[PDB]
């Protein structure tokens, strides 16, 4: 019976809530108050990257921490040299509306996607020169939000139709589809071991997936609005979510509970981009108040403000070696902070 | 040792800079429009987004139509903030209230608070039929129509019965009530009346864009 089905669902929800309560032996504040605060972390704009015409909705770092790819709404995909503020390539995309761009971990490929429901893989190490599409991935119903590379011939895409998909570029079809969300999936981050990935959607919940098994193992419900950005912790046993409720939350995968709520009465705007530092001590967050705010993940006390953008900050990512932070915002500038 | 690499890098940067300058010119030469609400408009102008290119008075317009996305719009509507105007095609023949608050949510969005909106009120023939005959649903789901009468500002170019005109301007003022309230020079919500037989919406959108860019130039060149 449908009412019996709802009763079973609510009984299971109560059981898991009771288990989570039993697993909350102590709070993060009690175990973290003893350590030294990180202090005021002030980093200046070490470099500004100009050349974009519209708001910058996506950016990504290379594995070398030296090459940078940025996606903006002018239908352009510029690959920058962060050290010498150059432009290795400028790929004109067929679809101007791009929300996600990906740099392959071994180079030679760059991905992009947006309101076209298509993830376009662009070959870099071509036989002769220039840049051309390698394969176009189609099948997603909603807009693509965040696509990240597993390796060559394997990509993971997040879409607005509540489903994430795993692809292989050579054949061109999906290997596994992920279902279980109610709202549009808005961001996606991969584990360092490339075995799991967490997706946050517009249903105020984040879910952990298994890439090959293809089912959702855990769900995390601690927010109160749409989650706009997710990011795995460097260790791989935690992640941080930013939502429209102006609260950043750190979730633990082995205790499926929220750990901290980095929030203030002053901050009303939501979080657009979230990225951890190399050690995970600092949790950089990009807000809609034309500011990026550097939190401390362990002690919820806020310890830094990256002022310098005059429009909404939408992109944020720490280098693979943790040497630079690039902040892409809606003023068509990529300021590199260090 | 690094001389050749640096020289090649600077040459590539110069080439990309020239390409980006040309793209800058072509990007500023064109205006972007969002079509929300609609097939007749895009048909008479000339996958998730259906591109449409048309040229009026030697100015390139880039209208964009969402056709493969879900009902939820609170996320992908934020990308259409730099567009010149959001073309809202209301039916205005209970779809009326849904269109009314789609317009309200567009109006009061903190990212569309600077983006102008063009209203069209697409249905006119069936509006005339519904006000001429039938059960008169216009007053059932909008009881204020009984008190409301034909405004004096109205110019009755089609000399039809007063009922269709008064209902049409009643819907228009219902939209303008939320357009004007909590609304200043950032946008204006240019209201228009259209239908299938209309073959001049291109000129209306063109003039609306002219006014929008005129206001932007006034704000930008300290002429206000």
């Amino acid at each position, epitope marked *: 019976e449908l009412d019996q089905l709802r009763q079973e669902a609510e009984q299971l929800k109560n059981q898991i809530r009771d288990a989570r309560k039993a697993c909350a032996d102590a709070t993060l504040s009690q175990i973290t108050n003893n350590i030294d605060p990180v202090g005021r972390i002030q980093m200046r704009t070490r470099r500004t990257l100009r050349g974009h015409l519209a708001k910058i909705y996506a950016m990504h770092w290379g594995t070398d921490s030296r090459l940078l790819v940025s996606a903006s709404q002018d239908g352009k995909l510029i690959i920058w040299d962060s050290y010498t503020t150059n432009k290795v390539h400028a790929i004109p995309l067929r679809s101007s509306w791009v929300m996600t761009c990906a740099y392959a971990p071994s180079g030679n490929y760059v991905a992009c996607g947006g309101l076209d429901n298509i993830c376009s893989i662009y070959n870099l190490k071509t036989r002769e020169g220039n840049v051309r599409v390698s394969r176009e991935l189609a099948g997603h119903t909603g807009y693509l939000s965040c696509c990240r590379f597993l390796d060559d011939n394997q990509i993971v895409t997040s879409s607005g139709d509540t489903t994430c998909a795993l692809w292989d570029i050579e054949t061109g079809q999906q290997t596994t589809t992920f279902t279980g969300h109610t709202g549009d999936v808005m961001s996606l981050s991969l584990a360092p071991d490339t075995r799991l990935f967490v997706s946050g959607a517009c249903d*105020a919940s984040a879910k952990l997936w298994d890439v090959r098994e293809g089912m959702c193992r855990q769900t995390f419900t601690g927010h109160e609005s749409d989650i706009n950005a997710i990011c795995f912790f460097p260790n791989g046993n935690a992640f941080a979510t930013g939502s429209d409720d102006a609260t950043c939350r750190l979730f633990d995968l082995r205790a499926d509970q929220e750990l901290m709520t980095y929030s203030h009465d002053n901050i009303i705007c939501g979080i657009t981009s979230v990225s951890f530092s190399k050690s995970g001590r600092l949790l950089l967050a990009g807000y809609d108040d034309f500011n990026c705010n550097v939190w401390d993940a362990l002690k919820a006390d806020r310890a830094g403000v990256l002022a310098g953008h005059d429009n909404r900050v939408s992109c944020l990512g720490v280098t693979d070696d943790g040497m630079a932070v690039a902040t892409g915002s809606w003023d068509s500038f990529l300021k590199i902070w260090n | 040792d690094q001389r050749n690499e640096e020289k090649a890098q600077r040459e590539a940067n110069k080439k990309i800079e020239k390409q980006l300058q040309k793209d800058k010119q072509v990007y500023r030469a064109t205006h972007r429009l969002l079509l929300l609400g609609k097939n007749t408009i895009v048909k008479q102008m000339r996958s998730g987004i259906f591109e449409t290119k048309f040229q009026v008075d030697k100015v390139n317009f880039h209208m964009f139509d969402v056709g493969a996305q879900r009902d*939820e719009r609170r996320k992908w509507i934020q990308c259409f903030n730099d567009v010149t105007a959001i073309i809202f095609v209301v039916a205005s023949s*209970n779809r009326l209230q849904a269109a009314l608050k789609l317009f309200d*949510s567009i109006w009061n*969005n903190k990212w569309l608070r600077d983006t102008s909106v063009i209203l069209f009120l697409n249905k006119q023939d069936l509006l005339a039929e519904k006000v001429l005959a039938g059960k008169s649903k216009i007053e059932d*789901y909008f009881p204020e129509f009984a008190r409301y009468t034909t405004p004096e500002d109205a110019t009755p170019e089609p000399g039809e019965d007063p009922r269709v005109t008064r209902a049409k301007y009643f819907i228009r003022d219902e939209f303008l009530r939320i357009s004007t309230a*909590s609304g200043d020079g950032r946008h204006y919500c240019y209201p228009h009346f259209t239908c299938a037989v209309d073959t001049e919406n291109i000129r209306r959108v063109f003039n609306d864009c002219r006014d929008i860019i005129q206001r932007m130039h006034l704000r930008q060149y300290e002429l206000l």
Partner: nanobody
Amino acid sequence: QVQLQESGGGLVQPGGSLRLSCAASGFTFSNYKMNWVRQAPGKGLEWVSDISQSGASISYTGSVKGRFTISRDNAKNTLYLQMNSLKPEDTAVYYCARCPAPFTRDCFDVTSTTYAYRGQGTQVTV
């Protein structure tokens, strides 16, 4: 977890004055433009009544103008809608929807087919 558990229901003849509220939990109940959406038999989700964060800009649809009154008890986390002089026009399941974002004045997606912050309704036959 966001939850909007409705309460109330029961058959009434035309002119009935039955009512009951929601049981909203999981959020602050003070920064949201909550409203009411009812699905008619064989009809999509439409809106009837709306209230602001504090309870100032109370707006109604035409069919409910002068019939039902919206109430928002902040300290009691209940959208305490009162249905007076009910008519056999509604005969719908009522959902206490919530604004998608806090500290904002736009309910962009409230009447969609699927929506996270809507909750399970209660059928009010009439």
